[PDB]
């Protein structure tokens, strides 16, 4: 059974769910109500904050691409990511940045490790832009 379809528009309604944050906090930011630095701010903090059907998360980085905000691997923040590359090869957040740029949002493949260890295993994100700032927020699911 596959069923999997049933996961991924899970996560893809989750990272919908980001999406919504952040334009909300852009949307008080154009209107002149907070700095776009605290808009920004804010919905890094939520970002931060929240986790969904246990442990999964979402992670902000910029079209660089450089990690903006990452809530389980936070040593990556401000690093460059050109060139980062999972155990096969592939630049994962070159990839994302590519897919949002020429698509505006998708799926993306790769291999990465579940919260709180280190191998990384097979996962499916998915990821959205938000222009005015140059991010792409994503959230993915462990395929096993
Ligand atoms: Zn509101």
Not at 27 to 42: L, P, V
Not at 58 to 76: G, I, K
Not at 116 to 133: C, M, N
């Amino acid at each position: 059974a596959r069923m999997l379809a049933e996961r991924q528009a899970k996560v893809r309604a989750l990272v919908e769910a980001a999406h919504g944050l952040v334009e909300h906090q852009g949307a008080r930011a154009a209107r002149g109500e907070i700095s776009a630095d605290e808009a920004r701010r804010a919905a890094l903090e939520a970002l931060r904050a929240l986790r969904y059907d246990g442990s999964e998360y979402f992670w902000v980085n910029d079209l660089e691409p450089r990690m903006v905000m990452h809530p389980t691997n936070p040593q990556l923040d401000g690093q460059d990511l050109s060139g980062y590359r999972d155990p096969n090869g592939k630049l994962l957040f070159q990839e994302f940045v590519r897919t949002v740029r020429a698509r505006g949002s998708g799926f993306v493949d790769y291999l990465w490790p579940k919260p709180g260890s280190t191998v990384p295993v097979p996962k499916i994100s998915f990821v959205t832009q938000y222009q005015p700032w140059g991010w792409v927020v994503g959230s993915g699911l462990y395929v096993d």
